[PDB]
Write a protein that binds this ligand. Structure first.
Ligand SMILES: Nc1ncnc2c1ncn2[C@@H]1O[C@H](COP(=O)(O)OP(=O)(O)NP(=O)(O)O)[C@@H](O)[C@H]1O
Ligand SMILES: Nc1ncnc2c1ncn2[C@@H]1O[C@H](COP(=O)(O)OP(=O)(O)NP(=O)(O)O)[C@@H](O)[C@H]1O
Ligand SMILES: Nc1ncnc2c1ncn2[C@@H]1O[C@H](COP(=O)(O)OP(=O)(O)NP(=O)(O)O)[C@@H](O)[C@H]1O
Ligand SMILES: Nc1ncnc2c1ncn2[C@@H]1O[C@H](COP(=O)(O)OP(=O)(O)NP(=O)(O)O)[C@@H](O)[C@H]1O
Ligand SMILES: Nc1ncnc2c1ncn2[C@@H]1O[C@H](COP(=O)(O)OP(=O)(O)NP(=O)(O)O)[C@@H](O)[C@H]1O
Ligand SMILES: [Mg+2]
Ligand SMILES: [Mg+2]
Ligand SMILES: [Mg+2]
Ligand SMILES: [Mg+2]
Lengths: 362, 362, 362, 362, 362
DNA sequence: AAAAAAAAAA
DNA sequence: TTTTTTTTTTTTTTT
């Protein structure tokens, strides 16, 4: 009997593999007899134990096949095809709702019986993040609205401030919450062309720690990053479709995604400042630093960087009526869960602990 | 049974699908039965609900196929071949007439009972756009005439003015009305051959926010753009055929499209000014800014940069005899629809509100 | 039943089609039955209505085939192979005679019952174009003599003059008269490889706008152009073969074609200038500008740029003995036809109108 | 009978072979009959004598086959697929435990009856290494734990010190112990992309002697290293997934490995210093120099550079409980072997010897 | 019946086609029936009329083939393989003997019964070339011997003299006879290494117009050629193999080819002078100056710069025994053709006329 | 070399 | 017609 190419494509669609080698490796694991397999007995990785029993019959025939990478490439092309359909056909609020469901699925595994995560530690991350900027929940919601509305010159936010002020921390958390890519535009213009091609069909880009000039009076070393962004100001506007490029593929024409620019206090040209709708001035705080070294699980488990921490913040602080109709059902359930496991008094003591620089759980 | 490559060519041709991954994605959605399909029920996308019932039988066989991307490649090659033939064989009047028919089809769906667009909001777009440049309806007709009369060396228009003056706004509207591609020539000169290759068989190009050398007082960052356009000088002239590159394809040779250059008050060489038949000076106006702040639907729905806003402007202001004979009958219907839904007095109140800087609809 | 690949190759040879997508586009239009075919009934395009009835039966089978672009590649390669053979085999007067013969075929369909041109406008172009230089008929006979004789180190002519001097209008007409290609050599020297590849099997190349060095005293931007040409000095001399790379293919070696350099008043190094045969100093005239201004049809119909206008000028001025003995059979027919259209009086009158700076007509 | 592609993939997996030509050469060795095979009788290389008898039947049929590289490519693709699966799915503690197992498998061969090496020479390495830096066993355990926890922005170490001070010695030993590659960030900034592409799927990286711009007054050569490294801030941070590229391969998105920066006493900008957890001030020891001059087998055998000498240090000094529970069995066996072969007095004498700069083994 | 790929390969080997399109194009011309076709009847191209007769049957079946480019590619690959075997395995005498045979067969086409070239003008070329130096036939014959023997040190010749002394004329004639290439060593040292890469696999190289440094006390432009060339000592001597690199390609090792230095009369250092075996003082001759003007067809068809003109000089002046035994039969035929058309008295009169400045050939 | 685009075998 | 094998370019290097 022949290998079903349909079942490989179905597995790739269910797990959302863009990576042809990862799909090959995953599916080859399904060779071995389901009745005994240690990974399913451990329930180690969910993209295995949920799928092995279904795919075992096909994976045994797949292992005999002489064209295995051709099968996996078609399956990856089917996942890339659906992603390009979704980008052109979904409303941008549907795209965010789809990302929130994927994060809520990940939360259901993390905080259940199987998962390692302790919501007490993750909500301590919510408390630490809510102390970073004034009215942080409103900041997050206003960012989401901006990324959803995609208003044709009002699409980018600027994060500015010293070393260890929290810019990359909040940017990486918003990058996981919305989904997107990080781009390093400090590299020279002849390689920059392929860096920008990583934005093809993405929801956000974050331009991380871009360097200007005129910094040596502050011992900030100069670089080309801000001169590179001002050559790309066509891409930051998003009024017209730009032509993105990746190796061997012909150019794709699209509106370049919304995003965040993070920098130290270099000077920004007025032409580029015109592209940024809002600037957030991050300031280092002594108590946030003292709190983190007494609360090291926040850094080790990467809680303060995680989109799941900002999503928990939105669940805790925002009204139900702000979420899209599809997720409001799951959101109401998560609000009940947080009010069951924390009183307001535990959370208010967590924020008091942060302001004192004491360990968040103390 | 057997997969029909012909039917995929029909769907690609009717959808006018240039992208192999988009065609693959869309056609695979037809594999599910149209008796239950929620997107046929909801009628969310016209590229689906019109076609699914016809293509279900073939999409079920396509989903079992091992050739899937090869089937899609030939269909896409047929759509690109149809554009090649049209680009050589049609007069520029007929090419523009076809683009107007395509926009009028889209207007019918958009302003019909199935559609989401309030015609009153888009006619407020016509009012805002008409206040940007004096005699803008004549500017638009003069531009269309200029792009149809592909007169060598009298082919390109220059847009000049400060930050937030309207250059990108109007160029983006003309780009959608006429059809064309935006090009960035601020990137370095070794890489531009593949940027210029996007102009193959396009009706217009727009060279967007290109940067001058010098002029670093006034805080304008210098860049290669204007020198790169003084290079490439025969591309702008269009007396001679230029040679254009796509990856894995031989050098296509054609007269490079006419177009617009938008730039931010840099100094232009006399050699390059000799290529531009008309310069438009965009000037920032306080009342347009305050009008937009109070009538934000214009930016959220992207009305003021849409080709449909300019097409509605031409339908309102130009006499029918200036449109092509084939499209007269459809345009008389639209003039009747606008005069039915709008008096002149409602529209003159809209223009009065724009000059007042209050909300255009108030 | 099978496709005849030989009928597709016969169509490509008949129409001299060397673009693979254009051949696919053209031949697919034959799949509809010719008896109701509007494009045949209207006789719009000769490349369709001549051939549809013959190729219909094969195009129906071709439309069902699964390897359509392979069939077209072989047909295109047959046409490119003929162009390659005739480039190496033909005596260089037969090359120019062949090029005249299908310019005369092109004229014969322009001015016929299905025609779309006025001989008075095209001869008004001849009258205008004859004014541009002293004894223009002798100059074009000198140029064509140089291009057929192709004497080593005596192969190129230099056109210099300020803005709007006529050098591109004449080079573009000579380009169409000989059927060369225009090469932009202002790109970086390491990336001219595929652009010089366009010169393979051509009769001329025109170096439109080679930017020089030291133009600042004249407000002329500098660039790589002249220094690239001086690094191509062996290509200009033509004493040795050069190795030209073009894609889907191995490299072709040939003596590089002769040609024209057009140049806006830059400083030129003696090592370059010393090996052009003749420099023509173009300069503007007030009466030509007012004449073109008062007779817009010349520009709109591309008359003054056209090698058909220069070919008509050769009919009107040169003895019948100058043309090749084989083409004289067509030249003598056009000779009597132009006398039948125009007396010397109306020609001299329009020569006077040009000299008076009034509209060339009447 | 047909060739088993499965048995080749099995050989590739058991050998961990990811070079197509090496796999082809290795499997072609097996075609010659087992009973006669001189490589099996001499027990030359374990990758042959273990596997030949099993694969001879298949290798004879492989040696006749016409698609030998296609067979090996799939087998190499299967090994690379497992590497990419394990890269995403393992915890970093398991990655390090798998590396320690592969090292202990090497140690079995090195110090066994067939082995080629003397434990006393290698343990003299442990004594020389422990004297290089104070509390070296804690420094190495703290390093392992730092690379395993991978705390963002708290995950690179700085090895700073003058000429000949042991930096590259310890870095090479740590790089073999953990696995990883060295990077030369001093290259011109265009090359930097393909340098950084070496970090793909690696557990560590080391930046070997990054040169700065300062310190000409202390006789340190200027270079671009520190300036290039400060462009890579987000690569050192590890908060965001950076987009690495190899030659011709498309961009792969991952968290950049943690690691070590080695440099002479150039000045470090505060933005780059803020990304290093620990500065280890390496300084030259008179006694280590006089010791190596009289114990040169350490250099000849490459003992002090080797991760096996650092692993022996960890087996000697650290409690059993600090190792992963999977490998504790082997660690306990190796502690008993070391206590059997070396009295503490033998090791004490070695350290007293190197402290005096006497030959370690005296 | 099936196409013989062997007959296509045989045609390519007998025509020496490196070119896949030229092979395809010529072979398709054989598809027409031999009894009637015009190119045969004209006897115009020997690469057709010799071969069409036998290849007709194969070309008819080849015209129906679907593989046409694949067949020609294999045939061309055989001719390239033939060249690479000959390149590595021939003696240097055989390489020159093959160049001679190709030139004699090219001569026999030019001068035969179906000829196209006036043997008297080419013999006036011999008379003008012989007058350029004392004992020119000994200069030519000894130079050929030097390049053939390729003796270390005794390997380069210095062509020195005033401006307009014929130095580049004679070097160009020797290049075409021996099959070399020309180099520009004047460049600053940076790009010199890619310039030396021109020499890979060439038989002979010429250093064209080597500018010296010290001469500009006179009108001689000071340049770096001599001091560059002094440093290239190992390339000149040819004792040891040197690395050569073509752009974008890896280095190859070979003995750098023998050659000529062409110089204006700069001072030469003693160390460079030792590496030339002979210096030729070219001097200006007024009677040759006036002879050129009175005979200019020599320049118009470059007879006095063609390799065939020097080969005619060797055929006229040198004995049969000095030519290679393989070619002596064709040389005896060619000697008799010159003897029967030119008496020594008529040829001596040509030399006398040249010596008198009489350009008339008589 | 690695991939995209393209052609041959049974 | 189903299934496997082949060619060529891009990229990279270069400036
Ligand atoms: N506001 C803050 N006050 C004190 N410590 C902070 C703050 N924000 C972040 N940190 C600490 O600094 C580390 C790095 O934060 P990060 O967001 O990368 O700083 P940043 O503003 O991006 N600095 P940089 O990227 O170097 O300009 C975090 O892991 C925290 O330990
Ligand atoms: N003439 C105008 N006066 C005031 N506001 C305007 C005007 N035109 C446009 N705007 C505002 O400017 C925004 C951007 O316009 P846009 O056409 O992109 O500017 P521009 O002239 O291209 N500036 P820039 O691209 O930076 O050179 C619009 O979204 C409006 O909010
Ligand atoms: N001798 C002339 N005097 C005045 N106008 C002229 C003359 N020749 C041409 N023109 C006008 O100049 C326009 C462009 O001529 P063209 O030969 O393309 O310019 P040019 O000299 O090449 N300019 P440039 O390419 O910038 O050097 C034509 O379309 C005419 O309108
Ligand atoms: N701490 C030390 N004191 C004295 N000699 C040492 C020390 N460590 C190493 N050596 C010797 O120095 C040699 C080079 O050591 P290595 O670790 O490569 O130096 P390094 O610090 O990397 N030098 P550099 O790379 O120039 O900064 C070793 O082979 C030893 O012979
Ligand atoms: N003895 C002679 N005296 C003067 N002119 C001559 C003589 N012999 C030949 N010529 C002509 O000299 C011209 C230039 O010679 P050529 O060899 O091209 O330059 P050259 O001698 O290399 N000068 P240069 O390159 O500046 O060193 C040719 O066109 C010859 O026809
Ligand atoms: Mg940062
Ligand atoms: Mg703009
Ligand atoms: Mg011009
Ligand atoms: Mg070192």
């Amino acid at each position: 009997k022949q290998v079903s190419w349909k079942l490989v494509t179905e597995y790739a669609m269910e797990t959302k593999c863009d990576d042809v080698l990862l799909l090959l490796g995953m599916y080859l694991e399904f060779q071995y007899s389901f009745e005994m397999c240690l990974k399913c007995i451990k329930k180690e990785q969910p993209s295995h134990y949920k799928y092995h029993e279904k795919h075992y019959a096909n994976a045994a025939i797949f292992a005999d096949s002489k064209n295995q990478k051709t099968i996996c490439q078609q399956a990856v092309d089917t996942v890339l095809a659906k992603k390009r359909v979704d980008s052109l056909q979904l409303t941008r609020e549907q795209m965010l709702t789809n990302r929130f469901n994927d994060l809520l699925d990940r939360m259901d595994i993390m905080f259940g019986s199987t998962g390692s995560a302790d919501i007490e530690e993750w909500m301590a991350g919510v408390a630490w993040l809510h102390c970073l900027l004034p009215k942080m929940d409103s900041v997050v919601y206003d960012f989401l609205k901006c990324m959803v509305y995609n208003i044709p010159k009002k699409r980018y936010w600027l994060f500015k401030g010293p070393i260890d002020s929290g810019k990359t921390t909040l940017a990486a958390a918003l990058l996981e919450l919305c989904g997107g890519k990080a781009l390093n535009v400090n590299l020279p213009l002849d390689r920059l062309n392929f860096e920008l091609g990583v934005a093809i069909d993405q929801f956000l880009v974050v331009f991380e720690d871009v360097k200007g000039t005129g910094g040596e009076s502050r011992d900030l070393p100069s670089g080309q990053g801000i001169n590179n962004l001002d050559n790309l100001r066509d891409y930051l506007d998003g009024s017209v479709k730009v032509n993105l490029e990746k190796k061997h593929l012909n150019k794709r024409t699209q509106i370049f995604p919304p995003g965040i620019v993070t920098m130290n206090e270099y000077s920004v040209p007025k032409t580029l400042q015109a592209r940024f709708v809002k600037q957030i001035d991050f300031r280092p705080k002594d108590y946030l630093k003292h709190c983190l070294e007494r609360s090291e699980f926040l850094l080790e488990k990467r809680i303060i960087q995680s989109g799941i921490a900002l999503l928990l913040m939105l669940i805790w602080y925002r009204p139900v009526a702000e979420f899209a109709q599809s997720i409001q059902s799951r959101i109401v359930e998560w609000k009940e869960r947080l009010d069951k496991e924390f009183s307001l008094s535990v959370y208010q003591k967590m924020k008091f602990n942060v302001a004192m620089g004491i360990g968040v759980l103390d």
